[PDB]
Structure formats: C-alpha cells, structure tokens
Amino acid sequence: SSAGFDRHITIFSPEGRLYQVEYAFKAINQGGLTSVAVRGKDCAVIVTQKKVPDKLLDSSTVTHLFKITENIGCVMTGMTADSRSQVQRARYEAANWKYKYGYEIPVDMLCKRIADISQVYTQNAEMRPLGCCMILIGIDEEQGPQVYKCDPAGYYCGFKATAAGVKQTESTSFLEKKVKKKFDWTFEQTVETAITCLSTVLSIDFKPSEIEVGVVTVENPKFRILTEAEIDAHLVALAE
Amino acid sequence: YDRGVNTFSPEGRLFQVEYAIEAIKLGSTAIGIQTSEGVCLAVEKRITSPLMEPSSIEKIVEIDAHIGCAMSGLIADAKTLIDKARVETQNHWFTYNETMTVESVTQAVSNLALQFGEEDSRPFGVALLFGGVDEKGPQLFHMDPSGTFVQCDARAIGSASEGAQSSLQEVYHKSMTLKEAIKSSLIILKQVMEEKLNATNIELATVQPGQNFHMFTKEELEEVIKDI
Amino acid sequence: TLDPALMRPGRLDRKIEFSLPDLEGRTHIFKIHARSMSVERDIRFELLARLCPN
Amino acid sequence: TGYDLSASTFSPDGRVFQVEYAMKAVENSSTAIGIRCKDGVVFGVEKLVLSKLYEEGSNKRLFNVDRHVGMAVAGLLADARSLADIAREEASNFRSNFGYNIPLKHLADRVAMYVHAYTLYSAVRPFGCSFMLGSYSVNDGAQLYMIDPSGVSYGYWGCAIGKARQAAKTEIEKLQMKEMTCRDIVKEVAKIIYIVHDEVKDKAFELELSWVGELTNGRHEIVPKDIREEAEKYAKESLK
Amino acid sequence: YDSNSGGEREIQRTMLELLNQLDGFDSRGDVKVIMATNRIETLDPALIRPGRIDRKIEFPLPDEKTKKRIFQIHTSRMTLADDVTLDDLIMAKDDLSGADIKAICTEAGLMALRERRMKVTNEDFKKSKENVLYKKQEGTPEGLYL
Amino acid sequence: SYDRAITVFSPDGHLFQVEYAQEAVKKGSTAVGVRGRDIVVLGVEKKSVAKLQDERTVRKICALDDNVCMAFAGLTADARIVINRARVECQSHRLTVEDPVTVEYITRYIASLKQRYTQSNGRRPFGISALIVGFDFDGTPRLYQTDPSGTYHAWKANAIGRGAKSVREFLEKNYTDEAIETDDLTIKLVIKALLEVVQSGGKNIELAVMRRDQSLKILNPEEIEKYVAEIEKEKEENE
Amino acid sequence: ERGYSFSLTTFSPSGKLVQIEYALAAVAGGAPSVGIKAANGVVLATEKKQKSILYDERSVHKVEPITKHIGLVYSGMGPDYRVLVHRARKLAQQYYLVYQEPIPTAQLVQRVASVMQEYTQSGGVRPFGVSLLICGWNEGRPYLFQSDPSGAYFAWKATAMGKNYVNGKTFLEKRYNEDLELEDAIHTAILTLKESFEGQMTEDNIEVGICNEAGFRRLTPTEVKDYLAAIA
Amino acid sequence: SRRYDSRTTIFSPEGRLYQVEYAMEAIGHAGTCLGILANDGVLLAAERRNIHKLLDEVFFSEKIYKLNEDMACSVAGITSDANVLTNELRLIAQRYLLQYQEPIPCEQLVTALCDIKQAYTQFGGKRPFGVSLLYIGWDKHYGFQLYQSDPSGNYGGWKATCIGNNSAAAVSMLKQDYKEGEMTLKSALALAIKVLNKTMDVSKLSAEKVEIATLTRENGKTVIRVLKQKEVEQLIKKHEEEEAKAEREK
Amino acid sequence: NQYDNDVTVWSPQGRIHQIEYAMEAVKQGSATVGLKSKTHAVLVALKRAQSELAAHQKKILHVDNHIGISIAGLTADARLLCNFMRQECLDSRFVFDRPLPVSRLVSLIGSKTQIPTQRYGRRPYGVGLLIAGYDDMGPHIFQTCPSANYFDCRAMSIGARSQSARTYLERHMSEFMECNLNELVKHGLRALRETLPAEQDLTTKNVSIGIVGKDLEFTIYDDDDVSPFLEGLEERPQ
C-alpha cells in the first residue's frame, strides 16, 4: 500500500519495504543490453554486446568497457548518462588511494567506496539514486582474479561467474549448470563459455563486431580490450 | 489552498501583492493636499475606547526636519519603513551636507517594497503619503506595497479611498492657498467619518517653506473647527 | 438550470441578468426603507452603503 | 501523473518523465544538421523569419566556443546561451592549467557532466537544449559530437536536431563522407535544408552555414555568405 | 431532499405546508411563533433567510455564578439537614449543569433511604458528588495557560 | 538554515497566524490593571491552585527592572522568553544611557521584537499579550499593552484573558475620577472588577501595587480578606 | 542542497512515531541471529546464506570486529550496516586518542545509539533499518547489548533477532540456564540457529564469532565445520 | 520540495496547539513516576515497565539519572529522547560550576532546560520532545525541592506530583492523604508503597518491578541513596502487615 | 493544472507555463515604440496617469551617455534590472576606460535573467525592455522578454495592443533609413497613435521621446520639448 509519500521519496512502507530503490533495479533494463562476467583460474573475461542502429555512428565511442586504472577494468549497464558519472567517481577515488596510501588499490576496496556513495543517494530523500550497475575485474596479489558487482541499492559481493543487464534469470541459470558440474577453466574454456552463454540466451549466433572482450590475465595484469580480428579467432574456434 | 507565494497568475498578475492592496481598505483614511504655499496633511485616529489615551496613537510621523508621513494599514509594519526612512536621510546629510529631497527619500523606501522571498518573507501591508518642502518647492508623493512610486497633487487613501477622491476632484484647482486647503480637507473628512469631529479624532501637520518644522497641536485644531 | 433546448430560438432569446448596485442603487434602497418609519431628518445614508460592500 | 513533477523521483516502471518532457521540447524546434568530411566539419542551421521580427543576422544559433570549436544549438534558445558560456569558461581553464588547446573528447565530457547534474535534484530542472560540437586538429582530425538533454554524448558522422530529425538524416546517409571535400559539402548541406521544411507553416527562412577544418587552418569561422553565394543557387536547382 | 420512496414524502409536504400556512399572508391576527432546536447547521436555510424569521437568539454557556441558585432551587424541596455543606461542592467541580445537580439530589435522596433515614447527611452529598459527577470529566488544558 | 514562509496573506486581505494567536490569548487567565496619580495597581484572576502544591514558582507578575512591572496572558512558555529577553534590554540600556529605562522604551523593544518575529520565515509567533506598568521620572504613572501582532497602545484600564470583553464593559460603565482619588478604593475597585470574572473567594485574586517610589509589594491574603469585606459591606448599602 | 532540514517523522494523533514502527518491520524481515552470554564469553551466531552457488562466501562478512575485543552483528538490512560500522570504528578511536585505554563496551552503545537517535530526529533522512548485537569482555565480566532503529539500548542474556525471533525467544528461554561455558553456548547457539534455516548447515551457511577474555576471536570455517558435527 | 513538509509550527484553526498536544496526551502511556517531600529527605518512585527474565540489570540506575552531586531525575517518555536531554542537562550543570565555583541551584537548572524544549517547538519544524521528567535536589536557599517538566517547556513547583496517566488516580489519593510538615523517611516511603500497590496493576507488588531512590543531607554531602534489594522487600512485608492489621476491623 | 505552478516543473506538452504567464505581464503595460535610422535611435513611449491629479508614470529612463531603455512590465523588476544596468556601464568605464558596446551588455542581461527561471523558489523577471544604444558600429534597437531571448531588430513595439503598431512599421521599414530626425521621430509617433482609441490622442502630457545618435548624448524629452515634435501631423481618418 501507499502511506504518506512512500511511492515518491525514499521512506518506508507499512510492509517494511521501500519502492524507489526497487524501482531503480528495473531502471537498468531500459538500456536493452546484457553484460556477462566470468572468472577463470588465471583470468577474468568481460563480454558485452553493443547495438549500433545507425550507419552514421562511430564504432569506437560506444563501448561500455571502461578502464578505471591500469589493472582494473569495468563494464557499465543501465542508462548511459548515469553510468559515466559513476566511472569518474571510480577513476577519482582510485587515484586518491595512490596519493594517500602509496600502493595500488585492491579491486575489493574500490567497491566499498562506490557502494557507500550509492548508500547516501538512497539515504537523503531529496535526490535521485543513479540507477545503473557496475561490474569490476582485476588481479590481486596472492589472491588471483576477482569479480565484483555494485548495485544502486549500495551493496556488493564476490562472485565466480554472474551476468547482468536485461537477462539475469536466463543467463545465471545457464551458468549454474556450467559451474557446478566442475569443468576445467584455463583461458579459452573461460572465453568460450563466456560467448556461448550470451549466444544461447540471446540466441543470435553473431558476427565478430558487436561483442567486446575485456580479459585480464595473471601473466598480463594490464586491462586489455580485444581487437576485432582476434575476437573472430575465438569465435571460429568454438565453431566446430 | 496553499500555492506558491511567488507565482504569476494565469491572467498575468500576482497573487499576494494583489492581496496586499486589499488590506489597505480596512485602514483609516488620510488626506494630503499639495499647495504652493505648503503641504497640508490630515488623518483620522479612530479611537475605539475612552479608556485608551489618544496621543499614543499617531499617524503623522516626522522624517528628518521638513518631511511628514501618513500611514494607513498595518501599524507595526509601517514602523519598519519609518525607522529606515529616518536613517537614510541621515546618511545623506552626513555624507553630503545637504538635505535629501522628498522624491529621493521615497526611492530609498520603495527599494525594499518587494524584496521579500525565501533567501537573500511577505510583502508589507501599508500605503504611505510622503509630503515635504525641498528645493523644487513643496512636494507630495504616494506609494503602495507594490513599490509603485508616483507623485500626486492631492491623494486620499484609506477606508474612504473612492469616496474622498471623487469629492476632492470636485473642489480643487491649481491656485489654492494653505488656509483654504486645510478647511477643505476636514469637510471631506467629516463626510466620510462615522463619529463627530472634535480635537481628539483628527490631527493636522502643515509644512511650509518658511516654517519648515511642521507643527500643529490641540487648542488650535478647535479654532479651525469652530470657524467652519 | 439552463436548457440548450430552451435556448433554441423560439423559446428563450434575450439574456437579461441582474447585478449589484455600485453606490447609488444601494442608497436608493436606504431612502425608501426609511421614509415609512420615523427617522431623524439630520442623518445620511451614503455612510451606510459604504459599510455594505456586498 | 503524480510521478512526473520532480526530476528526483522515479516512475513505477523506472524512468524519469522530467527528462522525457524536456526532450520533446527540443523536438519542437527548427532543423539544424551537421556533417563532417575527411578534413573538416560543416554546420548548417535553418533559421526562421516570421515576417520581419528582427534584423538580418540576429540571434544566430552558430556559436563559437573556442578558436577551433563550434556549436549548432537547437531548442530553447535562452538555455543554449547558458551552455555556450559554460563551454566557453571550461575551455579557458584547460588553457590556463595545462597550456594547450582543449581536445573535443574532454569538452564533450565536461559539458555533459554539467547537463547530467541538473537531472538529479528537485531544486533545478533539466536543460531544454541539444547541440553539436565540431572541431578540427592536425593531430586528431575532425570530430563531431552530439549532446541530448539527458547527457548521453558520443560520436557521429552526421546528425540532425529539430522537428525534421528523422526526415533529414534519411538522405544524409545517401551521401559519402570520406571522398568529399568540405567545399563540396557546403553545397550539399544547403540542399538538405532546402529539401525538407516546405514553406507551408513558415514561408520565409534563412540559411546560416558555419565551417571549421583544414581550409580554415583549424580556426572556426562562418562561411563567406554574401561572397560567392553558391549555397542557395545550387540548392534551388532541385525543383523537380 | 426528495427521494422516490413513500417514506420521505410525508415529511417534505408537511414541511412545505407549514411554511405555506405560516405565511399564507391573508389574516393571521398576530400569531407569535417560538422555534427551538439544539443545532442550527443542519437545518433549513430558507427559514434562516429574512422575510420569515428575523430573530436568531443564541444561549451561550453559563458560569459558576448561575449555579448557586440552581443548587439552591434543586436543594429546596427536600429534607436538607443542617449539617451539610453545599458551598464546597460548588467550589470544587467546575463543569456541571442543571441535570447534573438534579442527578446529585436524587443520589443524595437515595443514599438516605438505604440506611433507613429521613434527612440527608453531608457525606451523602460528598459521595454523590464523587460518584455521579464522574462521567464526563475528560479534556482540559490545565497548567499551560495564563 | 530554514527558508519557509509561515505567515502569508489571505484572499480577503487578512492574515492567518495572527488571528489564530489571538485565540490563545483569549484562552488565558484574566488580569486587569488601572492607574492613578501616585500609585498604580494590577491584579490577576483565576489562580486555580491545587491547594497542596508549591506556589512561589507559579508567580506570573514579575519586574523587568526596579521600575517596570509585567502582567501577561496566553501560554506561559512564550512569556518566559520575552521576559528574560526584556530584562537584558533594560539592563543594557542602563549601560549606555545612565537613566532608568522609561516605560515607553521597553514597550517598543517588545513590540518591535514581536513584529519581526512574525515577519521572518519558519517562526511560530508568540501567543502572549502583556500589561506593562511603570511610573517614570517626574512621577508619571501610565500603563501600556502589547498584542501578538506587534502593536502597542496606552490605556487607563486594561483587561485580557478569558472574558476580557465583560470586564472591559464593566470598566466602561465606571469612568469616575473619585475611584482614582483614594488609594484603597482603587485597590478595591480592581477587586470589584476582578470579582465578576471568577468565583473570587478572596483566594484566587493575586494583586500587587506600586506607589511610584518602591518596588512591587504583593498584598497579603489577610489583606485580601479585609478588602473583600469592605467591598461586600459598601455594596449592601444600596437599600 | 537548499537548506530544507524539515523533520519528516512526526507524532501521530494517537501519540506514536509511525516511521520508526515501520523501520522495525524491516528488521523482522532480515536474517536471523542469536547472541548468548555464558559467564566466560559471549557467542554471536548469524545465519548467512547465498541466493545461488555463484557467490563467494569469503567476501562479505557478518561477524565484524570493532577494536580488538568488541564484536558486532546485525539482523536488519545490508547496506545500512556498513555505515554505522565505519562510524563505530572511527568513534572508538577518539576514545583511545584521549584516554589511551580501550573503550568499554558499555561506552560504545551509549555513543552509537546517540548517533542513531539524533539521526531520526533530524530532517530529510529516514531512520536506519538495522538492529545490532554488540558484545565484548571488558573488566572480567562480559557484556551483550542490543540496539534498535529508535536508538534504544538494552542488556540481554540470550536474545534473538531477525525472522522467527519469537520461536527462538521461547527456545532460549527454556534451553539457556543461568550459566554455561563458552563451548556449551556455541552448542546451543547452533541448536537455535537452524530453527528456520534450510536443511544443509555447512561451514558456509553459518558464521560464528566469540569474545573470550583473551579478546574477540572470529571462528574460521574450519572450526565451524569441525564443531557442526553432532550439533544440536 | 514543499509538499513533503509536515508543518509542526502552525497553530490549530481552533486557536491552540496541534503537535505538542499529541505528545502531552501520549506521555501517560507506559510510565509511572512520583516523588514526595515535606521534611528532610525526598524520594523518587519508579516502575519497571517490562522485567523479562533474560535481562542483566547491571547498570543499577535504570530510570534514575544522577545528573549532579546534588540532584537527580526520573524520566518518562521516549527512551532515546531522554538520553539527549540527560546528556545536555548534565552538561549545563557543569558549565555553571566552571563559571562560578558554586553548585547550580535547582530552580535555574530547570529553566535552562525548558528554554531548550520550547525553542524546538516554535521555529525549525523540528519534532518536539515527548519527554516529561521530574526533579529532586537541594540548594542553599530553600532546600528540598520538586519540579515537573513538560514537553511544552513549562515547569512548576510541586510536593506530590506524578507523570503517568495511571497515576492520575494517585493524585486523587495524594489530595486525600498528604501531610504538611510531618514527613519522615518512613511515613513517606510507606505512603509510596501504598500508592504503587493500588495504581500499578501488578499483584502483590513484586520487588523487581519498582525502584526507589532517596536524597538526604547527611553532614555536608547531600547523599543520593539508591536502595537495591532487600530493603524494598521488607518494606512490602511491613506494608502487607499493616494492611493485615487494619483489615481486622472488617 | 498541477504542473502549472512552479518554474522547475516541465509540462507533458513540453512548455513551461510560468514563462508563458510572464509574457502576459508584459502585455498589461502601456505601449512603446523603438526604431532607428543610419545615424539615430529614437524610442517613443506612452504614459498612463493613475488619476486626474496624479502625475503620469515615467517610462523612459537614462542609463548611460549612449544607452537608454524603455519599460513595459513591473516596477520592482524595472529598477532591479536598471540598477544592474547602470552598474555594468560604469565598471567598464572604470576598468577599460571605454563605453560598453551595446551588444555585449545585453548578453549579460540574458545571462542575468536565466538563473531566476531555472532554480526553485524564484520568479521570472516579468518585464519588457527596448534597449536603444549607439557604439562604434551604429545605432541599435534591442528588445528582451522574460524568457531571456534578446532580439536585434530595426523597429519593434511591446506593450498593450502593440500588434497594431507592428503593422505600421512593416509597411514603412524601407523609409526608416534616409530620414534625418524630424521625419524619423514623426514616423515613430504615428505608430503610437494607432495603439490608441479614436477619441483621445497624444496631448504633450503622456508621451516622451528619447534620442541618441552619433553627435548626440541620450536625451529624454517630456512635456515641454515634446511640443516642437508634435506639429505638422494629421488626424486619424475614419
């Protein structure tokens, strides 16, 4: 039910709920776009398609793969204007970790800084809570790769493989049966399962021009965006 | 029933400044006439009870030395405009060694007539009649809570707003005298007031070019009544 | 209670409404409603209409 | 209704109607197009003359932010001059702090974060404007950008703002882009403004062309309009 | 109000016929009419309008000044013993009407008959004041106003 | 940091909060006060004591200085702020100008405080109405009053509280100079005027006088018995 | 902002605060917990599940230390918990920079709740939706306190919050005697933890932290899996 | 923006308060306190509102807050809004001693709090306090004093006041049975045990449900006594014996 | 009607109604006409008296030695922008020791009136201006609006029934170049008299004329020197 102004500002309902945050959970889905995060044993793959409807539109100013630091990359879902404001916060507070502390920020500590900022926007009743998601990858010293996800509610947790965007209940249900059967995960087994999970949920069987791969390696800790030629190499390899 | 306090009407006017002009009609009437011999000025006190001592109620307030006033509306809101108008004539004299003219007094009062808001309140609820003698002869000005400064020859404001102005234009011309303008004003007052005309209901204040200090008390007001 | 079918031409054509007096129609009422009773011949009725806005 | 008053509240499905209302305010405005050749950017703005109503050259919507940066504003003209002052003020601080000319990739991002910031609070409204950013450099080439009232800013080759948005860009993509000099583009822009917007609602109209590129040495200026007058003569040849 | 049933039609005509018969304006012979209700806000507006009734007499609430006679009048037709005090009962209670004092006087009469007496003692008036008058004492802003 | 107007105009040309604040003055205990030529008098009605509890802290007639005396109406919380504010002003006036503060200067401090307290934003106006009594230099007994709107006047006999119109109508039919001639007649006159306000058994009447040479002296409850007795004695001589 | 600062939590005409009663409804729909004081240590036991098998249980922690000997758990919501933990971390340091001595457990709860009460009266915000269980062994005798979104504080012996707390309240009223040991307390905290948990209680379904007199000690999942054998 | 404001400032159109009246009618629910004096000594009776078996009671001063070396208070209302006022009023009493090196009298401490509670009702739109508390103590001018605080910011001098709505029947007892200058430390305590036996609905007056704190003036110390465990019980066994003796006339 | 209250709130039609309600405040004022030539910029205004004894409210007001404005809206918003207008002219006189160009002065005005049309709690400045200046490139006639859209025009008119004045100016805009002063002014006051009823006209008591030019400081004429300008006219035919 609606009591007071519970449907408008961030206050409580009589049922112990609130609505503006769970309205923001389906503020992501109007983008019409899906991102998949898969962690391996020595790598972390980020695969996400893009839609280019116009011929008079660049193929380089669209990609949601953003470089936070030299060792931390991210992908953005939700709406576009709110996602880029979230990235400049992430670029900035990763730089203050270097100036204040001296060593490079962990990928786990950066999601605490982001989720506490999204807490306050929920918390003050006179501003908008920035509906967009946030998925990070990175290599940690003596911990291996990591995958984290932030939310507009303002909470994070660790992951092994979890997609976001529009199709979660279809993509994660595919990834549950993929992981719990205890397969191997080296490099290309991770990349091939990251393509086919998007290729069975969306059921497209595309051409190597819409998806982008943002893999990071233990041997190569730099965040790396793949070339269109080598994306085609991984795609025809899984085509038997 | 609670709209914005600063909102234009769909027809184009204002909301609360329009209500401010309505709140002058309940006030007491006041008449001032500009004449080349000098400016006379009249008001009605409207005594409510005989226990109330009358001389603590005033409507004519001097400003610096040669400028009078006449309030009609809310009393304590007018006391803010008076106390500012006294100071702004003193800053003019202790920075220029000359008397501020009657027009430029009213400009300094009419600046904050509509300077209300949330940052940087409500509009005031009193209309005034500034009259004085400066270098351009005697002057008489009229303002309102909308800040619409204007000059009048013989303005009458208060409760008898329409009734006095119609009777006043009936008997007025350019070559008046001072004694003729004094007796003509109280003829208008006794037609529009509800009580009788004595030395306790009304009061006068006439400023002259020679007699600069406007000065009028009891036992002379009875002389003007009994001669008419 | 205004029928458009009565406002078809043939039934009701001309609009005549009645309004309030400005000043003098009120004082016209005061002078008539006081001659019937014994009043003072030294009073006025314009002051009473000023006290009656509506 | 009930959810479309503040720009801070969400709809019960998860969007903001205050941004949605401001976008179609920009839609009720005259057509302004932009297109880049291989070595420059050509602007074209249709300008309306009611009967006389002003001079010949008043209130021109071809602003001039920097020495090498242009504007093609369209929509509510009063807020367009506000963004033109913010973009002017932004390019001077890049000059003072860093000592060289502002890249257009920053100048689109710095302005769009200011447009985005007026879509979060109940105190302010979103800007009712949309505009184009055209530049040219010897180390970066020509770029052409495009900013909506929400704040989504990315690259284009040809874009269009106004009432005739989808109707004008249909024949922009019929042209070629790489194999055209910008002297050829000037007479190609002039027919697109002349083809669309028939003289039915508005009989008389103007045509202002602005142009920056390799022929203009990187500096932005208006084309010689009264000189050589090749725009409207070649445009009115499409009479059948 | 007019409805369609046969329940309200016996009211509206009789209301209209009384308004008709009061003001038939033929010959009445100076008939005076006093009408009394408690409330006025849910009444007939066209009888409040002039031309029919031009007297609207209101009865505001009394004080403790009017009570002392009502205490004397109600404690007059009884066997008031000469060992009772009424002035303390007036001073203590600050809200009571003529019905309450009469309810005290009957309770004072009942307590005398219980223990088989004729006259009424002072404790009966005290116990009647503390039993009967405890039914409506609720709601007052004490200790805030001056 | 609060920006919200509370007192705005009405469509007919009135206010809202000022007429509402005068209602709280109407729901208060009555307190009258007259003057004379050498001695002033003021008394309060509706004491309403519990008769088992303390009473030195329920005293609502105070003095701002050694010359000026107070008597308010309305709610008691808003009076305590105005009184302790006005004690500071009449003490800081003595710091600059060496005189005792006149009764005219302290009422313009209270009334102009109470007006700008309604002019501003986000501020609940006061709900009190004071009776300011004090005889200045040259022996000038006079009394003023205030109002929640911020106006001030000079009266010769004031009445406030619950049923001031009945008391003011009683004093209206009592325009004598003989009652302001004798001192104890004027004190009994206040007791006569306050008698037809409350039940007035000589125990709910707290009066205090000032003979323009001394601070306020509360009369005794034994004094109030002899004053109520001589009032009832001369009233029965109408036969 | 603008400078509004107007309180959105007012008194009902019945005379209650409505929004604080609604914040307690969000606490009751949280994860269950149980805290038992047993005369030599205090045992905090929460009930930590994952929605899928895709999460990582070594990332988000429930039983959280404060200084060295003060543990703290919750039963309300998730993101509001991390604010007043970081607030209580910093607040325990100004005690140590002034007094050079570790803060008593009674002293934090006076200060955390005074943050939390003043937080509700202020304008433009909502109250928290988190109740706490703060414990620690200071000056020999251990302590176990509970806060709430109203900002009140209590002193329990064996309480339970979260879902089905009334079932755990009657169970601990019968099971817990006046005094036990720490090992008897861990056995009965698990014996009330799965009153409404799922069937499987692995090392990742629960997470238990204790406060010895040696200090706060969070149990690793090895000892939790080694103690969960023959539990209840 | 402006349609979310609650308007805790505007008068009622009746012409009285609208927000403070809700709290002053709320304050009688779930609280019972009283205090009596007529001679040397003054007490404070409290009431444990919920005494559950799984509780510590390790604080030994639950509702009594010793705010000074000479004064204490009994609070009733919002639990947490009490902690704001007791932290403030304890600090007002200490900045007085810093300024004068003289203990704060009981009168001008209560007035210092009631100016704070009033100012959060007039301006700001803040939620007002829902706290009514009592005062005891000793000064050098009058001695043993009692005061009653209100959420409106109004106080007063008392001798047998109370707080709770259940204790409105106790005032009817205290008007019926009170002595003027005959108080002991036995006649005052046995009266309070007689009040809470009737006003509380707890049968037989369990000693873990009441709480009594007294203030006496020993030599120069003003000893604030908080009595704990067995003196309460033998006071009940004294009171139950006097009830069993007086009922023999029946 | 719930979105027709504040300035921050947009519309489902896409049009802010508080600006649309501010345009109607300009039409309540009296009419005034500004035009120019090659060498001069003349604006002529029409005054209104409140009563028969009160003086006429002034319309034209001096700002600088080469800039003068007219007025068509409120009076508080008149002097509030007037005090901003005088302040900017003497700052550049103090800093650069040169008179301001007229075009970049008005760009400061449109930036000034933009802030109270976007933030909450402020009204738009409901006022209309006719800025007439002269600088190093010729005379200028500028009009503004509460929507903060300034127009470089050659001849406009704003106020009550100003549509009838515009139709006179469109069919005479060609003659407004080769005209010196006397036929420059008397073309302007024929536009005012077509904004009048057919029973009263200009009577040297409700009309003022301000001229600024190449060799002429901005001079305001009223009630004495208007009479040499009001001669050689003809009555309105009917």
**Cβ atoms < 10 Å from Cβ of G160:** 27
User: In chain A, whose CA is at the least distance from the CA of D12?
Assistant: A23
For G107, phi then psi, to 5°, come to -85, -30
φ, ψ at E70 (rounded to 5°): -65, -35
Amino acid, single-letter form, for residue F174: N
Burial class (CB in 10 A: 0-12, 13-18, 19+), D80: buried
Tell me which chain A residue has its CA closest to the CA of residue H1. Answer: A126
Residue B28 CB: number of other CB atoms within 10 A?
19
In sequence order, which residues have a C-beta less than 8 Å from that of residue D133 and are 6 or more positions away? Answer: D65, D69, D70, D71, D104, D107, D108, D143, D144, D145, D146, D147
Rounded to a whole number of angstroms, the distance between the first and last alpha carbons of chain H is 71
Distance (Å) from the C-alpha of residue D23 to the closest C-alpha of chain I? 8
Q: CA of B19: which chain F residue's CA is closest?
A: F13
Q: Which residues of D touch A19 (CB under 8 A)?
A: 12
What residues in B contact C46, CB-CB < 8 Å? 163
Token code pair at residue F94? 């003595």
Which residue of chain A has the CA closest to G25?
A16
Beta bridge partners of H74: H64
Sequence-distant contacts of E14-23: CB under 8 A, at least 24 apart? E15/E44, E19/E46, E19/E47, E19/E52, E22/E52, E23/E52
**What whole-number distance in Å separates Cα of residue D197 and Cα of residue D162?**
11
Dihedral sign for Cα atoms in the order H149, H152, H156, H162: negative
Chains E and G touch (3+ CB pairs under 8 A): no
Q: Which chain B residues touch F5 with a CB distance below 8 Å? A: 5, 118, 121-122
Neighboring chain B residues of C50 at a CB cutoff of 8 Å: 160, 163, 192
Chain G interface mutation, best of F3, F121, F123, highest count of G Cβ atoms under 10 Å: F3
CA distance H229 to chain F (A): 32
Determine, for residues F172 and B50 on separate chains, whether the beta-carbon distance falls below 8 Å: yes
Q: Which residues pair with F217 in a beta bridge?
A: F209
* Touching pair H, E by Cβ (3+ pairs < 8 Å): yes
Identify the H or E element spanning A238. Answer: helix A228-238
How is chain D classified by DSSP, letter by letter?
Answer: --SSS-SSSPPTTS--HHHHHHHHHHHSS--EEEEEETTEEEEEEEEE-SSS-S-SS-S-S--B-SSSEEE--EE-HHHHHHHHHHHHHHHHHHHHHH-SPPPHHHHHHHHHHHHHGGGSBSSS----EEEEEEEEETTTEEEEEEE-SS--EEEBSEEEESSSSTTTHHHHTTS-STT--HHHHHHHHHHHHHHSS-TTT-S-EEEEEEEEETTTTT-EEE--STTT--HHHHHTT---
F124 near H CB under 8 A: yes
Integer Cα distance of G88 and A41 in angstroms: 37
Token code pair at residue E25 = 């304006």
I25 chain-B contacts, CB cut-off 8 A:
8, 12-13
Contact F9, F19 (CB under 8 A): no
Q: Coil, strand, or helix at residue F93?
A: helix
List CB contacts (< 8 A) between A124 and chain G. Answer: 1, 124-125
DSSP assignment of H75-110: EEE-HHHHHHHHHHHHHHHHHHHHHHSSPPPSHHHH
Rama region for B40: left / alpha / beta (φ>0; ψ in -120 to 50; rest):
beta
How far apart are the CA of H242 and the nearest CA of chain F, in angstroms?
26
Q: Which two tokens stand for residue D123?
A: 């105190």
Report the residue of chain I nearest D7, measured CA to CA. I9
d(CA F93, CA F99) in angstroms, rounded, equals: 8
Q: Say if H154 is an interface residue toward chain E (CB within 8 Å).
A: yes
Q: Between chains, do F3 and G5 touch, taking CB under 8 Å as contact? A: no
Determine which helix (DSSP H) or strand (DSSP E) holds G118, and give its type and residue range: helix G105-121
Strands H73-77 and H64-65: antiparallel
- Structural determination approach: cryo-EM
Chains D and A touch (3+ CB pairs under 8 A): yes
- Supply the DSSP string of A132-178, one letter for each residue: B-EEEEEEETTTEEEEEEE-TTS--EEESB--EES-STTHHHHHHHH
Chain I, nearest residue to H1 by Cα: I120
Contact D25, D154 (CB under 8 A): no
- The verdict on a CB contact (< 8 Å) between F81 and H115 is yes
Give the mutation candidate from B166, B194, B195 for the C interface (greatest C CB count, under 10 A): B194
Domain boundaries, chain D: 1-240
- Name the region of G227 (left: φ>0; alpha: ψ -120 to 50; beta: rest): alpha
Residues of D with CB under 8 A from a CB of A: 2-3, 6-16, 109, 112-113, 116, 119-122, 150-152, 154-159, 169, 172-173
Confirm or reject contact between F212 and chain H (CB < 8 A).
no
Amino acid I20 reads E
Neighbouring chains to I with at least 3 Cβ pairs closer than 8 Å: B, D, H
Between vectors from CA B45 to CA B44 and to CA B46, what angle results, nearest 5°? 100
The residues that bridge with F207 in the sheet, in sequence order, are: F43
* Residue type (1 letter), I172: H
Cβ contact, residue pair A80, D152, below 8 Å:
yes
The answer, for H5 touching chain I at a CB cutoff of 8 Å, is no
Q: Which residues of A touch H (CB under 8 A)?
A: 5, 9, 125
SS3 H18: coil
Domain boundaries, given as residue ranges, for chain G: 1-232
Mutate one of G6, G21, G24, G42 to test the H interface: name it (highest H CB count within 10 A): G6
Query: Would residue F235 be called left, alpha or beta, if left means φ above 0 and alpha means ψ between -120 and 50 degrees?
Result: alpha
Among the partner residues E91, E142, E145, nearest to F75 by beta-carbon distance: E145
Residues of chain B contacting I24 with CB distance shorter than 8 Å: 8, 10-12
Nearest to H176 by CA among H191, H166, H197, H193: H191
Residues D1-240: name the CATH superfamily: Aminohydrolase, N-terminal nucleophile (Ntn) domain (3.60.20.10)
Q: Spelled out in words, what is the top-level CATH class assigned to the domain G1-232?
A: alpha beta
Compare CB distances from B19 to F10, F157, F158 and report the shortest one's residue.
Answer: F10
Note whether E141 contacts H: Cβ–Cβ < 8 A.
yes
Q: Which residues of H touch G117 (CB under 8 A)?
A: 80-81, 83-84
Asked if the Cβ–Cβ distance from I28 to B10 is below 8 Å, we say no
Q: What is the DSSP letter of A20?
A: H
Half-sphere exposure of A64 (CA within 13 A, CB side): 32
Subunit contact B19:F9, Cβ cutoff 8 A: yes
Distance from CA of G162 to the nearest CA of H (A): 18
Neighbours of chain C (3+ CB pairs under 8 A): B
Closest partner residue to B122 among F9, F142, F151, by Cβ? Answer: F9
Largest CA distance in chain G: 61
Do chain A and C touch: 3 or more Cβ pairs under 8 angstroms? no
Question: DSSP 3-state assignment of G39?
Answer: coil
H2–chain I nearest CA distance, Å: 10
d(CA H44, CA H33): 7
Give the residue carrying structure tokens 């805009």.
I173
- The residues with which F153 forms a beta bridge, in sequence order, are F145
Within 35-54 of C, beta carbons closer than 8 Å to B belong to 46-47, 50
Closest chain B CA to residue I17: B10
Q: Which residues of B touch F136 (CB under 8 A)?
A: none
Return residues 6-45 of F near H (CB < 8 Å). 6, 17, 20-24, 26-27
Burial class (CB in 10 A: 0-12, 13-18, 19+), A136: buried
Distance from the Cα of H174 to chain G's closest Cα (Å) equals 28
